[PDB]
Amino acid sequence: LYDPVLQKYDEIPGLSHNCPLWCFREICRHISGPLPDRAPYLYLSAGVFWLMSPR
Amino acid sequence: SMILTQFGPFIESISGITDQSNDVFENAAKAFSMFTRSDVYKALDEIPFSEDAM
Amino acid sequence: GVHDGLQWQRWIRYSWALCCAFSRQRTMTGESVGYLQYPMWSFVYWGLPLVKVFGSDPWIFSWYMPTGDLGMYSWISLIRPLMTRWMVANGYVTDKCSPVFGNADYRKCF
Amino acid sequence: GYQCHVCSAVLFSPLDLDAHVASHLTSSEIQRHITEFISSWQNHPIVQVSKTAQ
Amino acid sequence: PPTASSGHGYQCHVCSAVLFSPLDLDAHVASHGLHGDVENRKTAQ
Amino acid sequence: AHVASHGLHGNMTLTSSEIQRHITEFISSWQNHPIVQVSADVENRKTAQ
Amino acid sequence: VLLQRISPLQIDPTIISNTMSTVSESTTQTLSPASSILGKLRPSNSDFS
Amino acid sequence: LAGKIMLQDVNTVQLARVVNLAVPDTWMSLDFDTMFKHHVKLLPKDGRHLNTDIPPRMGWLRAILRFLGAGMAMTATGVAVDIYLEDIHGGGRSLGQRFMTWMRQE
DSSP, rough: BBBBTTTBBOOOGGGGHHHHHHHHHHHHHHTTTSOOOSSEEEETTTOEEEEOOOO | OHHHTTTTTTGTTTSSSOOOOOOHHHHHHHHHOOOOOOHHHHHHOOOOSSSSSS | TTTOOOOHHHHHHHHHHHHHHHHHOOOOTTTOOOOOOOHHHHHTTTOOSSSOOOOHHHHHOSOOOOOOOOHHHHHHHHHHHHHHHHHHHOEEEEEEEETEEEEOOOOTOO | OOSEEEEEOEEEEHHHHHHHHHHOOOOOOHHHHHHHHHSSSOTTTTTOOOOOOO | OOOOOOOOOOOTTTOHHHHHHHHHHHHHHHHHHHHHHHHHHHOOO | HHHHHHHHHGGGOOOOOOHHHHHHHHHHHHHTTTTTTOOSSSSSSSOOO | OOHHOSOOOOOOOOHHHHHTTTTTOOOOSOOOOHHHHHEEEEEHHHOOO | OHHHHHHHHOTTTTTTTTOOOOGGGGGGGSHHHHHHTTSOOOTTTTOSSSSOOOOOOOHHHHHHHHHHHHHHHHHHHSSOOOOOOOOOOSHHHHHHHHHHHTOOOO
């Protein structure tokens, strides 16, 4: 992202450097496993539902 | 690249590259709602990482 | 996020992302599948700083706009002649010389 | 493309801009009174020029 | 007379933005570059 | 300010150039300040002595 | 053009504004001559050839 | 108190509530009263204009001119530049008369 004050792009790293995204999708992949669904729970006004993997 | 395909115009409508029209903002909202959780995590599995995140 | 010292290039754009992410609704009213759509302009009334509008420069003004008619007035009157040039582009012209936009109209385009 | 400074209107001819600015002093009530004066005297047959009766 | 014509053309290399007219495309790039007839015959005779 | 004087006054418009001309005037106003030109926090082995 | 290149002075009309914005006034008049001198002198352009 | 309220010139922030204006939440980190009562101003550096005039009665407009000039001076990026009054196209009489016609209703 360009800065009109500093006349530069930013130097923050992009997607490929965050432990939360990679670890997040790692947790979801292992908890769901080879099961066809992927999200470990769904939020709902009527209430949260859980995925049935034994782990 | 998947979100790049559905958000060809919109992602630079709001990054200071192309002009922000309304129609692309609502196209973005259409693509936001018409969407699911398997698409969430295949978008997440799409990206690689650069050996400091792991 | 405003009241604390957050990187503004990357906070405002993410706020656009969330803001548009919670726009549509998909109701279940009778006989019709209705779509409830807010335009961006309700949020711009509520104090969302525009990035680049009508061919202007990017990241043009700040988020210190008063969330109402005041700030609406402020950023519209910063850029109003550039607005009128964008108005005569894709020409929407009617000969009544308005005191605020001149030869360009407003009712059709807006 | 030529744009005037009052009213922000845009034209294509500089002579059109000069006539436009010429169309564009003192108090607003004094301009009100001279407009109502000239409108009251604008079409009388004093300023206006150009079978019976034994 | 100093004015601005409603032009055609959109690209800017530094900052990667697109704009309205070339008449201020060049000024925006300049901001980038700053910061960071016998009478005619006798007359010419 | 001279090129901006060639800018017609009643048709002011926000440009990036219009932002940073005020930035330059602000920084020059801070530079011409009589105390900050001589004040500096670190010593030099002489002043500390 | 040649004398404009050589000559050491520079013309800026802003001295007129910077002074005549300090003249006394009363703002309830039909007119007071500061706006009249600035209007009839209208010095916004340079173009002094 | 009802006798007092007439002749006393109120604070700038008072007349915001007349026009249902309010200071937004983001500004109280900053010092605002400084740039209200010292920097946004009328009688611009061009001078007087006879359109930049205010009638002697109903000088409640001065607060709102300070508010709007402050908003225009600060919403843009960069230094909070001082801001001067280019004309108001109708005169203060007709302009404040329009505000009277708005406040004829609630």
